[PDB]
Design a protein around this nucleic acid. Sequence first.
RNA 1: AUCUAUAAUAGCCUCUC
RNA 2: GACGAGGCUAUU
Lengths: 173, 45, 60, 133, 237
Amino acid sequence: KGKQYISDVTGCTMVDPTNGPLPEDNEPSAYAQLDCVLEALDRMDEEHPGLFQAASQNAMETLMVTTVDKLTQGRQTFDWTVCRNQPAATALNTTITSFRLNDLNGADKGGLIPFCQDIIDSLDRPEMTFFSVKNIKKKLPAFLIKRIPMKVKDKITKVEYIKRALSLNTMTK
Amino acid sequence: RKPVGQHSMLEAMAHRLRMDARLDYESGRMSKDDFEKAMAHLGEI
Amino acid sequence: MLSNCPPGGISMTVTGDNTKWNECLNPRIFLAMTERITRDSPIWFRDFCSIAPVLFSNKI
Amino acid sequence: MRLDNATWGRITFGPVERVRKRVLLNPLTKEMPPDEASNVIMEILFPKEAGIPRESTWIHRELIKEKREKLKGTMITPIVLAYMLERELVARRRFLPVAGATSAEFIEMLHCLQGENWRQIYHPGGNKLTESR
Amino acid sequence: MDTFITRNFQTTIIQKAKNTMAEFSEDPELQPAMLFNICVHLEVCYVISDMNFLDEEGKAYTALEGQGKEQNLRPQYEVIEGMPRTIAWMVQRSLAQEHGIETPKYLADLFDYKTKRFIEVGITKGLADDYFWKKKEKLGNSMELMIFSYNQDYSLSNESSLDEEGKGRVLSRLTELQAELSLKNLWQVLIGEEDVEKGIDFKLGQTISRLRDISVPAGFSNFEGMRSYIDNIDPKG
RNA sequence: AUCUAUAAUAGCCUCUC
RNA sequence: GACGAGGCUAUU
Ligand SMILES: [Mg+2]
């Protein structure tokens, strides 16, 4: 029951329930009201003076003293270069190398902020060159199929790269 | 401790090995011939 | 809360779970939350904090 | 050794009200926050690649020499020695339920000290600080 | 502006100066003058590092033409400046550890093996003695410092460790630099004190800007309107 | 009076129908 | 094919 439109960046169908009609029953509703959320946040700010400011300042300091290697601390991470799941460190290394291929050397500065600037800029590149994995299939009689992976250069367009960056890889728990 | 630096690993290693070789030479740990070999390899690199 | 109960009244506790917590929460509301929280911050940090809700609003 | 040179008192059965407090797990002769301990360990084991001489290490300079005396000719891998030094210097503080004995010598035996319905008198071995007394 | 620096100072000098300003997080273009200073400082260091060489007897001797590369094995002085902070600190700590001298609290500019001391070379625009004393205020004797000046004024530390020829050569090089920058009309370019506040930069591109624009709640055209609404409105009631 | 301070990896537990 | 966060634990 929210605003449905088409994204002009990716061409995807977008649904926006915020500020939508108020519910008329007890079914789950995503139509949050911005005014009410802001009123609740202002009440929180009034009851805890300086809390938002202190939290923002501390987060800013931590970000300014945070390096690119903080991203290796994750588990299986979606890798857009292979459109697969790879260990967080492997995915970060692959992203850094691909960015190097596309004149994006922010990760060299060391901080997380320059690397995030590089990500933002990557979203604007008309094309993307990277290293991906390609498998060769061999017929081993038993017949069975044997897979030999290897690294190969690849190129994708701006919209494809943007969709890969915004992609989530889903699995079962 | 996590190493820190925006320079390449090759340059850091080269400088560290240069310093180690020179200090071994000055401390007597390395002789003339080994020092000449080490300096030649470092310069070639 | 037990000591703060007005005298002669009633205090009642609701054990509650929210249904469809992740399904119904919207990244746009989170963008608004981030913008409100970082009201007195430099513009660069406000943009940086707004990036993540924006990316999640366009997630695939 | 602290366990071995210890005396055990009686065991009593009765209500024991316990409060959750942030307490030290293991006794340390010298304690410093993790950053100071890391700087001291880098000084002891990797003096060459230690970087800026932070002034906070001044108080511990003498200690560093002492440690460099003991490890001059050791063939143990340096990282194991570093975590040994951390084990000796860095404190581990955790929230635990306690009832009337919060010193690390007692937190070591906490599991045997008391439950919710019983108390076990325990006299740890070693020496106790005057501040605790 | 930068053409003079590129032409006069070699590629290595400019590269190391730029690396140093990156280490300190100072933009070259916004603060060109500093760049130049770094270069000249680095330059003098190399000069004072290229005038002696240790021999088999551990004594200094001068250099000249006709010498083979093999004869130059270990320089008389080791250069600290012009290197990444981590590498320079490793070098200084290694020298201190292997010469039984406590590490000075601040990074040095040079190390002399003959006297086994750390030298902090400085370049001053005003009185040489005043700069010498101000540097003395930090450590004084732990790091013997020699100061040069654009007005042919030198303040060598107590333990002289160089000859008259080298000092004269350095002063003549500085004089030539002054004359060329004067006839090229760049002294005013450097004398200017123009250092405004500089902070972190995080600029949004076109794609991310559009994504944020189409990422606002219903009832807003773009993100700027949403931000203004969040900032200015009172949601009471 | 533990407030501070705190590298990395891995494990266990808790937190859509 | 097995994610995020919090706590605790072990190891280097
Ligand atoms: Mg519940």
